[PDB]
Amino acid sequence: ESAGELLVATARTQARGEVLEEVRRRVREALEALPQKPEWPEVVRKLALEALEALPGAKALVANPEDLPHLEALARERGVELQAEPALRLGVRAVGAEGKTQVENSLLARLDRAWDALSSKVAQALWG
Amino acid sequence: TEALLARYRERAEAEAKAVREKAMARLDEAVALVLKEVLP
Amino acid sequence: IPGIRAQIRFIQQVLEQREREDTFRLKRIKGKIEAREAEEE
Amino acid sequence: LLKKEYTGITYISGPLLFVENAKDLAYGAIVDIKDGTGRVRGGQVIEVSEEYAVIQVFEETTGLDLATTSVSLVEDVARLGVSKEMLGRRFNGIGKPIDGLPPITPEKRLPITGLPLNPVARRKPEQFIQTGISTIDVMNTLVRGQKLPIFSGSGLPANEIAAQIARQATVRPDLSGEGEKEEPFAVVFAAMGITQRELSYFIQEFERTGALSRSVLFLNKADDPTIERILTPRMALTVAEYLAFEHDYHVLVILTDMTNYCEALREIGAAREEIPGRRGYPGYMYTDLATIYERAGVVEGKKGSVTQIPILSMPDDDRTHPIPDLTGYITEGQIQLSRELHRKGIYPPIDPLPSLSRLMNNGVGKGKTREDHKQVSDQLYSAYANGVDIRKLVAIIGEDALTENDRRYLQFADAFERFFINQGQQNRSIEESLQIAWALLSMLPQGELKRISKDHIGKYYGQKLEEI
Amino acid sequence: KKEYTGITYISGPLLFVENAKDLAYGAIVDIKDGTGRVRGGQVIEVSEEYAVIQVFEETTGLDLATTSVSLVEDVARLGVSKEMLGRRFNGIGKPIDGLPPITPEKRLPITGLPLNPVARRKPEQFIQTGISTIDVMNTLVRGQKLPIFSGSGLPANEIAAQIARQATVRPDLSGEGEKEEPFAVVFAAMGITQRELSYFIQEFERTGALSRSVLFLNKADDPTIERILTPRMALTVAEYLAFEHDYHVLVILTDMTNYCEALREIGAAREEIPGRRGYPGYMYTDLATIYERAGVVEGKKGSVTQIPILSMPDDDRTHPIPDLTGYITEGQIQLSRELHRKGIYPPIDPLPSLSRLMNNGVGKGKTREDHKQVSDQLYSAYANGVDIRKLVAIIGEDALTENDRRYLQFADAFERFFINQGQQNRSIEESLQIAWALLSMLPQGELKRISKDHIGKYYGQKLEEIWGAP
Amino acid sequence: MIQGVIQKIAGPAVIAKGMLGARMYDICKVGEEGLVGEIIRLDGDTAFVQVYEDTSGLKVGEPVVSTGLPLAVELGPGMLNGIYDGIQRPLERIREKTGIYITRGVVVHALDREKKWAWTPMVKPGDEVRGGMVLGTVPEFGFTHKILVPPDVRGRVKEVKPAGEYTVEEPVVVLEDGTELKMYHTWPVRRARPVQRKLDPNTPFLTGMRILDVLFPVAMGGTAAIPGPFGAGKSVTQQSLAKWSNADVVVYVGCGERGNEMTDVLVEFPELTDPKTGGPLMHRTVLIANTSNMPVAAREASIYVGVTIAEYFRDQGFSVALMADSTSRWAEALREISSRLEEMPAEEGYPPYLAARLAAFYERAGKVITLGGEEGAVTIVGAVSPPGGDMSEPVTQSTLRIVGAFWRLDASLAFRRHFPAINWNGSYSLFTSALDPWYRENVAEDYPELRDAISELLQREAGLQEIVQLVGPDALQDAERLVIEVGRIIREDFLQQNAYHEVDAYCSMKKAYGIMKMILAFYKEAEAAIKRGVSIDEILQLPVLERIGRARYVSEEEFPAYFEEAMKEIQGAFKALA
Amino acid sequence: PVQRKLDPNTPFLTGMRILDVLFPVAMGGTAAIPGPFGAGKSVTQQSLAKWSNADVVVYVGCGERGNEMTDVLVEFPELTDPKTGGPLMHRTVLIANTSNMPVAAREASIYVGVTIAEYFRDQGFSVALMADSTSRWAEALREISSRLEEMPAEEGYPPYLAARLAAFYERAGKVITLGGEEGAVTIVGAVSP
Ligand SMILES: Nc1ncnc2c1ncn2[C@@H]1O[C@H](COP(=O)(O)OP(=O)(O)OP(=O)(O)O)[C@@H](O)[C@H]1O
Ligand SMILES: Nc1ncnc2c1ncn2[C@@H]1O[C@H](COP(=O)(O)OP(=O)(O)OP(=O)(O)O)[C@@H](O)[C@H]1O
Ligand SMILES: [Mg+2]
């Protein structure tokens, strides 16, 4: 008798999970195309500024070679270097002065770090 | 009996599909909201 | 008999507690001396 | 947000590791430790200074090294996402689902450390609970908001009694004059180092009763890491408080074995090199157990409630062992099972002499139950104690040396043990339990009923025990 | 002669020597001061900056300016040969009999290696100790570890000397393979005083047992590390003899309690945290490394048998020393202080003793066939008579059942004849004759544990203690 | 690999340097002799290694090499019929190598690299594989040993080897990802092997003995405990467990026994022949032996190695019985190791984490559905030897807090020639309620009630033992004397069981059910006879008692007819005779 | 500070027959009531608070249950002041520091309560003070000493525990106040061994 509604609860929960993962994979696909969007050079500088202000006295900056030409002007006026790296797609990383502390700032990591907070917002929007 | 279990399975399927159809009208709006928030 | 067994258990527990406290104090002072010798130099 | 990585690990030994230059970690913050193989394990900051920080690992430190390991900050304080949709869900004792269902959408993030309730914000517990156990309802009355742990042993069936109480718990609004029919309790069940046998029994009993729809389970199995056992009661209590004080639920909280919690705390303290207590336990165990027990009760200006039934096994049946000793100094009474009654086949093997309830005077009396309740319970205590001491005397001198009144007390004690305490799985009404108590009390002359007023004796004395 | 200088810290038994990275851990060194006196020492901890050495004896005249330290051996070794028989040593292999030193056939590490368990074989042959209570009711089997539990004032040394003097094998009773093999005794004394040393010397000299014995004698005032090392020396020599020259060896260790106290002292010296009751936590492993070096090996005719001797400090069997000994060994021999005070020697108490290998080393083809049943019946009868001895004092002798007087007489006769044998040596057959004679005091049909044919074969005999069992 | 040099030697603990990157709890080889050690602490460029064996003669500056992997066992064919030490080293190879003594630094492979095996492929090229699936079958002593893909490996088959003779080391199946899978794999001993799900215990574990099976049963995948008093027959009971049980493979662990006891168990076992096939019992056993003088670390890890092997065989789809000889000695080894680490004692010197270790070890037992979809189960019967027969001892307190059954052995009953000498007081089993549905479906619909009646009869006998001691059996009332006589009948005709008899050693459930039914029928007939007037000594001489006394020693296929004859004799005898 | 201290020659009526008869307590005296859990220390102290001749009652809930203080707060305003006949709560000062409240505040609560009692004594009243549990104060001292890395003496307690206890218990006693008026302080402390 309660097992009957158990199936209803499980089915609705799995459907909600399916649609929520649909939302997350769609936003993941859209964000990966943002580097191709011409606004990406306008956002890399904001990201590097946030990463550099988050770590006072940072020694160097790490980003993709494709993004280095845009960040080069920002680096000299802040008195920091810039590093080419095969990894670190669509993001910048701020290393500490002593080489022990690092600060990572990329859109995809921010997505995971904000999903826990925004899951309720997404669910309410879907089922308001 | 088995009739009750099958009926509960069918109502569960109906509820799940209704939920999916409800969310299909705002999947795009949810994507827009999350992309807005995760963008700095 | 039960009274004697209870008294024996009581005495044993007291002795074990005293031994444990002695060991803890010994290890604590040993650690302090080791600190003064090695970290402080 | 953005994540900051510290890779300056200096010293690893046992369950603790030191990070050199991580000055920016808040005290008590949660961090994640990542090894060279990509596996991430949890941790918690227990001590932070300018020179370094001390992070205690939630599990074993196998596979960690000083070269490639990195630690990432998670949050300033341990929080938990809660919702109404938690009912019927299952978790691994750290907040992770195991039932295969997708993770829940949080309503809020609340600290598992909790906060001390303001005494002026509390209100006195008043509501009678009818558990269907005469030895509990009549003599050790339980009240909503009370915390009443169970003291048992290795082979004693404490889990069965807890499951029966969960099955049979009711409020009986009619006697109190409220008239308001109420929804059943939502049951929060927390496990600590439980075996597969006990867990299977609990799951099967909850399925048969049909209480899984209103229950939340935090399962920390016996093979699960021991350091994670610390948090499980805290998360369970956080969920219970949230439900009760933000959604007007009536919550019953069950904790399977505080003995495992205390042993894990002892191990952690011994690793921490703290001052031992009486038997190697940490000296702060009283405050730690209080931070868990004190979270029950009821709140003025709100309709919810929280009730705890912790279960613990006394080591070697010693009431003076530090675990039950420190537990009894906090909770409002306890229920101690006796191995002798279990040997004699009595079920439930509840011994009413060492048992006590410190909130019975609140929810018992005129206008709440029958007005003769307290006097009946006190007289039953007196008569049972006299019968037991007479029985102790009998073994020395033999039966024949007794007088008639002493023999009568012996007969009453035997009848009490065989009828009142022993009831099996059946469910008894409070009126039926009072009737049985009066039938037993009828065996003694009216001159012996000193504790009971004349009017109650005149109203209720004279009936026979043959009714059952 | 690689010798170091540069001492930097001396306190009690320890001293630190710097720039000694060549020193191996556990090596033995020699400490020489300015006057040429040379003290022994052992390296206990080796580090890059300095090495830590524990001095054997006191440090009266040492100093930081003129001390010199030189290596002796990377690991402790002892030269062994077939000619060590008839010699005495001070506990580190130094002769003390005044005779010229022996020729070392080979040098062996005293820390012996564990035996391979699949190589071992079941003990099957007994040893005649010459004591009735031990040879009959608590038989000692070749390859056993049967400690003798003693009191404080009880005379254990006399028992040890008597066993060393009277122990021998009985190849005759084996029936087949009637040919004797060499027998030897290894004696280890730890923490004895001058008087006990003199007594042992005299006992081994007056009878001539020195011709088949090796003595390792260590005094109470000797250095502690020597007391620690002595049993390892004795067991190394015993193993060499037994498993190289086909010798049957019996090793007697005296006062394992003194060894335990020395172990406690050394553990406290190394700044190691004491375990339960103040003894080292590794005490069980250290004792197992000594006891477990005896047994019998497939394909070899030799054997090693151990009889540890220890006195319970406060008569407490739950004291850690006898408790761990009981964990490791296969029985015990209990000395009764009442028997000692009543003038009975040797004061062995049959009721609280036990031999766990007894059943497998006696019977057909090994000893006289009726051994086990006689032992069981004697034990039961003595236990039955002991309580009657106490009940008589309250109910009176005239009120006893007729069999109770016979049990009283049997207990008295057993005490006065079986246990109280004095210094005389007894054969196994003579001991069994005495046992049957004592059993003849009881009515036939009260012997529930003995087969009827054995009763018919051996019943009907008067006391043989007066006769001497010809 | 990561290589360093010695900086400081002090006892079994050695400090290394230049080892930045070494992982915790990983096995290191110290010195030219290659002594194995384990890392316990890391700080700076320094690793703290605990050498297993002795460290005499070592010098500062010797090389130290870390293997990069923790302690682990090799899982594959050839582990049957074998003898292993604490860390899974074949003792027979060691004997054939270094003689009768064990030298430090011996290197041998737990699985022989020289033997050939008959490979039988099961997979096909291009198949998807996942951890737990069967790759092939290799015959071994009448068993179909299935090679299992390692649990963590998931991929697709590329190359398969044809059927034939191959050695253990030869790679047989190569996956498309470049990973090579061979006849054996490796598993860390301190991580339990994964499974799909743990089923609840619902079927009995047939121990072959009436008392154990009927009064204090243990289910498949449960746990038990048993004291070890001397002269009580513990070894015989364990041997009968190894011989007559349901378990397909038997695993025995010696974890700190005496040398002579180990010799006894290693000599008795080769002469045993199981009733299943008549072949040597050693073909179904894995012996793990340890003497007290062996290194402490091996004694500590012996139980983990044994339980990991049992887990492997359970994953293979068998039912395994695992016996630990004395967990007290393992606890002593653990206490000594903890004392080496300078850890604060908790109680009686024992470390605080002892209860956690015992619980984690005991939880590995259970009945599961393996990763391959088959069914397997492991049952643990671990004996505990208290110091002086005291159960307040912390090890017994911890163990009795988690096990599902307890078998109180006693020396007094064995002294009275009652075998097995297992007391019915203090002994308890928690599996009876769960086994009641199975008993109803399997043996009889009334078996639980019959067992309860037997238990109540025993309790009635025990409730008046003081009067008989005071008075005596000859001078008693009819009811009490009949109760005590029926109790003695029960004790000597249903609880006792001869281990060395040809047909009495093994008893099924139906045989015991018949015994109990006959006993109850006799008791009710005797009560009716007393009610209508009879003397007890008239009852004693009925032939039904002599028939029940010989209810044992009958064939298990002859039991139905004998039971029917006994029932008819019981019903007819008490009407023709008073 | 006080002017002079006097000997106690007046009884302190606690309203219990056994305590008022067999083991009396004086106005300026001190009493200790130890016992196991469930013995009834709290009930006794609450009964003393309800039925006593003292002018002002100060209750210190040092490290005990919050429900105990909640019940007192709920029920006292309906009771009767034994002497003045007004509400009972008008004469009571409650200092509550429950078990889940910060540990280090247990030590400060005792001193705050005793200082308030001394002030009311200096005003010229006869004040009774109840300490709910000094064992919790001892535990707080032990915890702080552990944090200070001090050397333990007995069950981990710091060696200066008895000095603090004596200093706390010596603030009691009937005195002549600096204003020439008369007053006294009565201290009844519970111990949880
Ligand atoms: N079930 C049994 N049936 C018949 N004889 C038995 C049985 N159990 C034990 N015995 C007898 O006991 C002998 C071995 O068991 P015993 O009572 O001597 O103790 P044990 O197994 O050696 O004890 P432990 O291992 O505790 O030291 C057997 O050879 C046999 O004579
Ligand atoms: N004088 C009394 N009259 C009636 N009941 C009493 C009395 N003293 C104690 N009790 C009973 O004792 C219980 C309350 O005890 P109380 O809380 O005072 O104990 P305590 O010794 O202060 O314990 P703790 O130290 O654990 O706080 C109730 O069940 C109450 O009925
Ligand atoms: Mg209180």
Residue numbers in the entry:
A (entry chain L): 61 to 188
B (entry chain K): 81 to 120
C (entry chain G): 169 to 209
D (entry chain E): 3 to 470
E (entry chain D): 5 to 474
F (entry chain B): 1 to 578
G (entry chain C): 194 to 386
Text from the published report:
The V1 domain of Tth V/A-ATPase (A3B3D1F1) is an ATP-driven rotary motor where the central DF shaft rotates inside the hexameric A3B3 containing three catalytic sites, each composed of an AB dimer. When powered by ATP hydrolysis, the V1 domain rotates the central rotor against the A3B3 hexamer, composed of three catalytic AB dimers adopting different conformations (ABopen, ABsemi, and ABclosed). Here, we report the atomic models of 18 catalytic intermediates of the V1 domain of V/A-ATPase under different reaction conditions, determined by single particle cryo-EM.
Cryo-grids were prepared using a reaction mixture of nucleotide-free V/A-ATPase, containing the regenerating system and ATP at a saturating concentration of 6 mM. The reaction mixture was incubated for 120 s at 25 °C and then loaded onto a holey grid, followed by flash freezing. We determined three rotational states followed by focused refinement using a V1EG mask for each state. In these structures, nucleotide densities have been identified in the three catalytic sites. Hereafter, we refer to the structures obtained at ATP saturating conditions as V3nuc. The V3nuc structure, obtained under ATP saturation conditions shows all three catalytic sites occupied by ATP or the products of hydrolysis (ADP + Pi). In the V3nuc structure, where nucleotides are bound to all three AB dimers, three distinct but associated catalytic events occur at the three AB dimers simultaneously and these events are coupled to the first 120° rotation step of the DF shaft.
